[PDB]
CSV table of N, CA, C and O in Angstrom, one decimal:
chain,number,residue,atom,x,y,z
K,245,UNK,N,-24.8,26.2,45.0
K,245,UNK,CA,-24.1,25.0,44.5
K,245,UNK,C,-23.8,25.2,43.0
K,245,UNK,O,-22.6,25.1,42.8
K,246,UNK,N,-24.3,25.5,42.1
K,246,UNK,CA,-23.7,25.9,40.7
K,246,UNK,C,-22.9,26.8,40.6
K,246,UNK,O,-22.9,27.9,41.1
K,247,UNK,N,-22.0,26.2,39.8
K,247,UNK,CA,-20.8,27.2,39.2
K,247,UNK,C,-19.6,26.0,39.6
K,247,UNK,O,-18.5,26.3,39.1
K,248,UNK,N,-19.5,24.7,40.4
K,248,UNK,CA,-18.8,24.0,40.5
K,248,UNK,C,-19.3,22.9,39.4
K,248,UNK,O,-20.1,22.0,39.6
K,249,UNK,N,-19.0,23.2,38.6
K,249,UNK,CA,-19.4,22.1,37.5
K,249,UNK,C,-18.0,21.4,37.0
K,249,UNK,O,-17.0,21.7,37.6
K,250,UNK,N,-17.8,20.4,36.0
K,250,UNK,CA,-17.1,20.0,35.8
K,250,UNK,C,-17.0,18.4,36.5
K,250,UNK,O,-18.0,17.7,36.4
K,251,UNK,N,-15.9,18.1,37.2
K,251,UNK,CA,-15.8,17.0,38.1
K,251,UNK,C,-15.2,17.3,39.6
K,251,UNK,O,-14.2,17.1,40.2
K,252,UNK,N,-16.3,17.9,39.8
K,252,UNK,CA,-16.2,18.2,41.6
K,252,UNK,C,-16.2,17.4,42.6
K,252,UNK,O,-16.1,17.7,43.8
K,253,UNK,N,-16.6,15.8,41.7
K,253,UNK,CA,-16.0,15.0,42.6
K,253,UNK,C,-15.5,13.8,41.9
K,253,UNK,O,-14.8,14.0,41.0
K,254,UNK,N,-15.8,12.6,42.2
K,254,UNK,CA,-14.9,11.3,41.4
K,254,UNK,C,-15.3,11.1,39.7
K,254,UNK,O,-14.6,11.1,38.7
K,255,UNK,N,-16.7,11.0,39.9
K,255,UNK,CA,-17.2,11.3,38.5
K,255,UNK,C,-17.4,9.7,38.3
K,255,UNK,O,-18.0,8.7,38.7
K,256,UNK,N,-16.2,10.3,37.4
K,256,UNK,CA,-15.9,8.7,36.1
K,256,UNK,C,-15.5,7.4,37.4
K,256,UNK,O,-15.9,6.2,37.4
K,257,UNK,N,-14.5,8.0,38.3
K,257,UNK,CA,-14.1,6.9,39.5
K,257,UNK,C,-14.5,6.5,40.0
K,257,UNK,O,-14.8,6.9,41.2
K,258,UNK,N,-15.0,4.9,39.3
K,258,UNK,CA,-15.5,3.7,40.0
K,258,UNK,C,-15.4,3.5,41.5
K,258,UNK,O,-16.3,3.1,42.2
K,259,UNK,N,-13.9,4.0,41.9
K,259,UNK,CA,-14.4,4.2,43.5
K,259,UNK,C,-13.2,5.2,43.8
K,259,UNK,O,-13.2,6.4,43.3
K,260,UNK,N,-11.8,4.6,44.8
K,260,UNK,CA,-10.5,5.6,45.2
K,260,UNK,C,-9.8,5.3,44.0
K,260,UNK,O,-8.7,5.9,43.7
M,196,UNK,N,-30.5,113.8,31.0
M,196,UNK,CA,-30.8,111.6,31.6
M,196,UNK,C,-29.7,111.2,31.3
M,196,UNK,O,-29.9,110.0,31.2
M,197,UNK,N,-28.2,111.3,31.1
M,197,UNK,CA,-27.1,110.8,31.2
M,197,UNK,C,-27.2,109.6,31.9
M,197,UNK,O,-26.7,108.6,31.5
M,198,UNK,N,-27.8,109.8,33.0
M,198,UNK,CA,-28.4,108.6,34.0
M,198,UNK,C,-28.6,107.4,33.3
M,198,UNK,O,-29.4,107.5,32.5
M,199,UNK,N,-28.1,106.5,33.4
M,199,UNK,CA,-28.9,104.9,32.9
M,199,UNK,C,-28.1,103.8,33.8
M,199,UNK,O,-27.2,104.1,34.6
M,200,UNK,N,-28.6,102.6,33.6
M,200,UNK,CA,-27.6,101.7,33.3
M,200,UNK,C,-27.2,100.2,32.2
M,200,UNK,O,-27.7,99.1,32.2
M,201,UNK,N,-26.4,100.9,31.5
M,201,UNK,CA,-26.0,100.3,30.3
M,201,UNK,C,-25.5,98.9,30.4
M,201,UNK,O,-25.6,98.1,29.6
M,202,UNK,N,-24.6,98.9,32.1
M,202,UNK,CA,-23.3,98.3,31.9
M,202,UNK,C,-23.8,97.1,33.5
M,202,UNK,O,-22.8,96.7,34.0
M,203,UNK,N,-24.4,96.9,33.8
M,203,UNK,CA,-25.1,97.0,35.2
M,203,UNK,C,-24.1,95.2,35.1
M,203,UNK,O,-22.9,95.2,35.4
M,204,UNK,N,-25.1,93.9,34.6
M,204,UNK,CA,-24.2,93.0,34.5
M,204,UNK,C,-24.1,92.3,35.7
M,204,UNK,O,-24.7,92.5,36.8
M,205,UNK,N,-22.9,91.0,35.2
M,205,UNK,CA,-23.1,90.1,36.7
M,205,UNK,C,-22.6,89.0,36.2
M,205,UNK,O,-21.7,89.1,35.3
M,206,UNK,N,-23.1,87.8,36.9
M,206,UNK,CA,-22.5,86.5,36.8
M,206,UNK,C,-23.4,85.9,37.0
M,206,UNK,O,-23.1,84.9,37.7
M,207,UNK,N,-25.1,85.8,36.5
M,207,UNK,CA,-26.4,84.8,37.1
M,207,UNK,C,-25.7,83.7,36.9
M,207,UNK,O,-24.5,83.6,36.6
M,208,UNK,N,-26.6,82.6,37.2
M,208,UNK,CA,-26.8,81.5,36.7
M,208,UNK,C,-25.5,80.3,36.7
M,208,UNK,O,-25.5,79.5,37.7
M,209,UNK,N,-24.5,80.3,35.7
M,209,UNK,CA,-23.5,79.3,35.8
M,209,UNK,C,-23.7,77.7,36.0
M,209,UNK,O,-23.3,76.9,36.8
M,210,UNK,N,-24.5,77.7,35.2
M,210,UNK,CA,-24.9,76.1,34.9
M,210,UNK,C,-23.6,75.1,35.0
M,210,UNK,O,-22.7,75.0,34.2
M,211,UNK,N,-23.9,74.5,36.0
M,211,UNK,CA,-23.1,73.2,36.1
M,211,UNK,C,-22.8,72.6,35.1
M,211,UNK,O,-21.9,72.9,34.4
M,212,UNK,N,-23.8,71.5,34.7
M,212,UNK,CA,-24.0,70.4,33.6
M,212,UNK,C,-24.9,70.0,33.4
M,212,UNK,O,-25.6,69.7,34.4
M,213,UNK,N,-25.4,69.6,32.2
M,213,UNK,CA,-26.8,69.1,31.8
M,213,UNK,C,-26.8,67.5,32.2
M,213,UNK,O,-28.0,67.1,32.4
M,214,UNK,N,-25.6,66.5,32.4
M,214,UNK,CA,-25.4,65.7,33.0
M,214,UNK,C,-23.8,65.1,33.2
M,214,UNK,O,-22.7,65.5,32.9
M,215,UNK,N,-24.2,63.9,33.9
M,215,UNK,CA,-22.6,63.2,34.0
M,215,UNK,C,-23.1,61.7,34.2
M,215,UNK,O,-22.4,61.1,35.0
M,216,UNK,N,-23.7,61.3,33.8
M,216,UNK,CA,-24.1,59.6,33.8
M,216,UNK,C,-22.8,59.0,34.4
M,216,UNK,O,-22.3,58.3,33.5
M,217,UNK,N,-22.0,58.9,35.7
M,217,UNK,CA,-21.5,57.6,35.7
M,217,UNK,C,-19.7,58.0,36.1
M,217,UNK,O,-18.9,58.1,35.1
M,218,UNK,N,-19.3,58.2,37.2
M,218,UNK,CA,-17.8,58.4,37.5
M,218,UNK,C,-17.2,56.7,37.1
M,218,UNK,O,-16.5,56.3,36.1
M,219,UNK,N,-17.9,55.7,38.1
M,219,UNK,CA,-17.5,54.5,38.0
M,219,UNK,C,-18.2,53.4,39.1
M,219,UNK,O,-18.0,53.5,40.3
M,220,UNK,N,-18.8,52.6,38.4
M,220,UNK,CA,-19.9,51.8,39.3
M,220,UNK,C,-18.9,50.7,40.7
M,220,UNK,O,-18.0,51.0,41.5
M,221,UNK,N,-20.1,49.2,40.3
M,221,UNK,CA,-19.1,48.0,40.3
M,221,UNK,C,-18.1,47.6,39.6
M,221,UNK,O,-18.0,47.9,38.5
M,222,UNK,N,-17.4,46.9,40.1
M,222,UNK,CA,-16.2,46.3,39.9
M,222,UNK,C,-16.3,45.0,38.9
M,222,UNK,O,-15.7,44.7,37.9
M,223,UNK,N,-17.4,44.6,39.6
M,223,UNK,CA,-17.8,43.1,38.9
M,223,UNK,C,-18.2,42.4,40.2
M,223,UNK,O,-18.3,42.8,41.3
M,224,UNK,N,-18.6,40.9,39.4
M,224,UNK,CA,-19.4,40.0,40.1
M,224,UNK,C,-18.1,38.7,40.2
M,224,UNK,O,-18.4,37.6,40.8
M,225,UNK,N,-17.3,38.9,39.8
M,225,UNK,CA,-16.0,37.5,39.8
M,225,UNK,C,-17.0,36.5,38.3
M,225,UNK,O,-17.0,36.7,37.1
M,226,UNK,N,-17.5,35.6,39.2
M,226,UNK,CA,-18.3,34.8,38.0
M,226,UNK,C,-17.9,33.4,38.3
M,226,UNK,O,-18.0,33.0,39.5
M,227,UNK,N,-17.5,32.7,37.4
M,227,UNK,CA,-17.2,31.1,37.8
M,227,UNK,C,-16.0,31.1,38.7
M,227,UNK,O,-14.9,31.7,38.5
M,228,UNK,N,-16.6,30.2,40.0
M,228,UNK,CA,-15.7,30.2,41.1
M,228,UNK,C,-14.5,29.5,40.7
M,228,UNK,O,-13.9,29.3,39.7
M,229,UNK,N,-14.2,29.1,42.2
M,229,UNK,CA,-12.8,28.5,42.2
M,229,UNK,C,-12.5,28.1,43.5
M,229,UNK,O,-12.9,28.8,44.4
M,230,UNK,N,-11.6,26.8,43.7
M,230,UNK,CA,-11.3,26.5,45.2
M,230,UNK,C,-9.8,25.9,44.5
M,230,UNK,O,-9.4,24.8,44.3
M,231,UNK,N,-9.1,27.4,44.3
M,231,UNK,CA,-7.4,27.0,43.6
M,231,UNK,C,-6.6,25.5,43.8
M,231,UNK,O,-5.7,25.4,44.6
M,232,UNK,N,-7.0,24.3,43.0
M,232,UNK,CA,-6.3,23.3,43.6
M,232,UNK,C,-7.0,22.0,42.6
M,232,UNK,O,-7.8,22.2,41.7
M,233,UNK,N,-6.5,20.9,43.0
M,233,UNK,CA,-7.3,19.8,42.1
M,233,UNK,C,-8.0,19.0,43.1
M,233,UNK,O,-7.5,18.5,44.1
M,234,UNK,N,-9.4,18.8,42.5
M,234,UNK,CA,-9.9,17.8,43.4
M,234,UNK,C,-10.5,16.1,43.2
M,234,UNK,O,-11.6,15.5,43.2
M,235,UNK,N,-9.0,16.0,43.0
M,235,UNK,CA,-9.4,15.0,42.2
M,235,UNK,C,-10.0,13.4,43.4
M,235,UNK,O,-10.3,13.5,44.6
M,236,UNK,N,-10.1,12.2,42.7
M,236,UNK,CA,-10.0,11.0,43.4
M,236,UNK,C,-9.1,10.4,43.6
M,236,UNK,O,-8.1,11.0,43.2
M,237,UNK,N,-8.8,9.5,44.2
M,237,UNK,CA,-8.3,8.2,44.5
M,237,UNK,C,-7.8,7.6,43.0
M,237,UNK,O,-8.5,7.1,42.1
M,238,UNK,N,-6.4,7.6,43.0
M,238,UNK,CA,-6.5,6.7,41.5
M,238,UNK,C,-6.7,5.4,41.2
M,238,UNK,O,-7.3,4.8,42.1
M,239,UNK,N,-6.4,4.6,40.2
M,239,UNK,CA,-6.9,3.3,40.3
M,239,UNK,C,-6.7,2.7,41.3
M,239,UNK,O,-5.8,3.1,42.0
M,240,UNK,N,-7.5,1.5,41.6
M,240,UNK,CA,-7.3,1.0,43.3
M,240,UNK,C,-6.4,0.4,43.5
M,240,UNK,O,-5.9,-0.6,42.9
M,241,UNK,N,-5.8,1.2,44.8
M,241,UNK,CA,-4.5,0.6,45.3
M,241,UNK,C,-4.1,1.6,46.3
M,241,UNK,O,-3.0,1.4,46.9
């Protein structure tokens, strides 16, 4: 799993 | 004794090389991935 760092997924997004 | 030999000679030995460390290894390891594209969210709701 590391090396996908950053925002690999929503993050900041409250939701869609 | 004219007889000898003076001149006798040859080619012994002919050493290669004392070394050569290294034509060419790996290539590499890449390093920080990638899945070419954005992956992003859903933008504000709607």
């Amino acid at each position: 799993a590391p090396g996908s760092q950053g925002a690999p997924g929503l993050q900041g997004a409250p939701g869609a | 004794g004219a007889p000898g030999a003076p001149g006798s000679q040859g080619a012994p030995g002919l050493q290669g090389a004392p070394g050569a460390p290294g034509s060419q290894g790996a290539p590499g390891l890449q390093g920080a991935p990638g899945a070419p594209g954005s992956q992003g969210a859903p933008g504000l709701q709607g």
